[PDB]
Amino acid sequence: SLIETADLRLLLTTVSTEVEAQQLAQAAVEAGLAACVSITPIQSCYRWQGAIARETEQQMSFKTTVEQLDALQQWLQSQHPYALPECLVLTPIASSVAYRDWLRSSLS
Amino acid sequence: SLIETADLRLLLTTVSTEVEAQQLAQAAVEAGLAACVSITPIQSCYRWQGAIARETEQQMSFKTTVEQLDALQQWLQSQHPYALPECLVLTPIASSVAYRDWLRSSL
Amino acid sequence: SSLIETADLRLLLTTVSTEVEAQQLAQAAVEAGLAACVSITPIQSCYRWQGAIARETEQQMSFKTTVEQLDALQQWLQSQHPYALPECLVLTPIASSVAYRDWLRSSL
């Protein structure tokens, strides 16, 4: 049942706290900006303003379409305006018809 | 030993429980359909059945080749606990010579 | 904050066995200028080893870098990774924000 896909997108970002991740995920789905969101606890080590830090974060992966992606990304920024958040987008190359159709059905 | 690659695939899906994930991963490797499978605990938020839900799940990532991918997905569908499984496929664009060779040879 | 097309960012994925190993390798890669950020996630990995199915705890690592540093990062992993034959899978994000891409590039 695999089909080629070019219009699905995964938006990856991080936030510091579980509570923020949960709230952002719920509201993005309610807004029709993403169909599904996963939240994974991580540790991140990074260069920021000269120094190296290791902090706990929540990795978020938002499932959306190319049509909703800009709106989603801008909306997420609006939710933590003080942050320069991680923003990486991946394009899946295939999916199932049913999963693709469900995902597209979930967006507004 | 970095090489450009086009024939490797990652198939992403989720299941509800650790037990389900462990069993499905083992069976896929046993069948020669995936070289290796990672399992990561997540929380997932989505609307289903008219209502927004947040539930704990296990993210699975199956490493395979383009040649085995259809067989893996057909198998996974027959064996997956969900009526509508997540199915997303990524293509890595580079690997190491040794890792690519391991993955392909293991199938 | 707007999304822009990106072709020169890379995510290198590998695993190690322990949290300590992952923290040390991540710190060392950032210190050497080979990655801007490294995330670490505990996982289980299932694979066949010596003819038998194994399932082991591991740490999934994701190194955020540029195409220009990718070869040097992989070469450095040849010497520094704890495993003789590490996982090595590289993804290319297709978009990012201007701010994030600029942060990542300026960190290296």
Give the key terms.
alpha+beta; globular; Alpha-Beta Plaits; ferredoxin fold; homotrimer; four-stranded antiparallel sheet; trimeric; alleged copper binding protein; PII superfamily; metal binding protein
Kindly, what is the distance between the CA atoms of the first and last residues of chain A, rounded to a whole number of angstroms? 26 Å
CATH hierarchy class name of chain A: Alpha Beta
Main sheet characteristics of chain A:
4 strands, antiparallel
| Residue fraction in strands of chain A | 35-45%
Helix content range of chain A: 25-40%
Which oligomeric state applies?
Answer: homotrimer
Order of helices and strands of chain A: EEHEEHEEH
The general outline of chain A is: globular
Strand runs of chain A, count: 6
How many helices of chain A in DSSP terms? 3
**Pair with the biggest interface:** B-C, 27 and 28 residues
Structural class based on helices, strands and sheet pairing of chain A: alpha+beta
Q: What's the Cα radius of gyration of chain A?
A: 15 Å
What is the strand arrangement across the widest sheet of chain A? 3-4-2-5
Quickly count the domains of chain A. Answer: 1
Could you tell me the CATH topology label of chain A.
Alpha-Beta Plaits
CATH architecture of chain A: 2-Layer Sandwich
GO molecular function (chain C): copper ion binding
Organism (chain C): Synechococcus elongatus (strain ATCC 33912 / PCC 7942 / FACHB-805)
InterPro entries (chain C): Ion_tolerance_CutA, N-reg_PII-like_a/b, N-reg_PII/ATP_PRibTrfase_C
Family (chain C): Belongs to the CutA family.
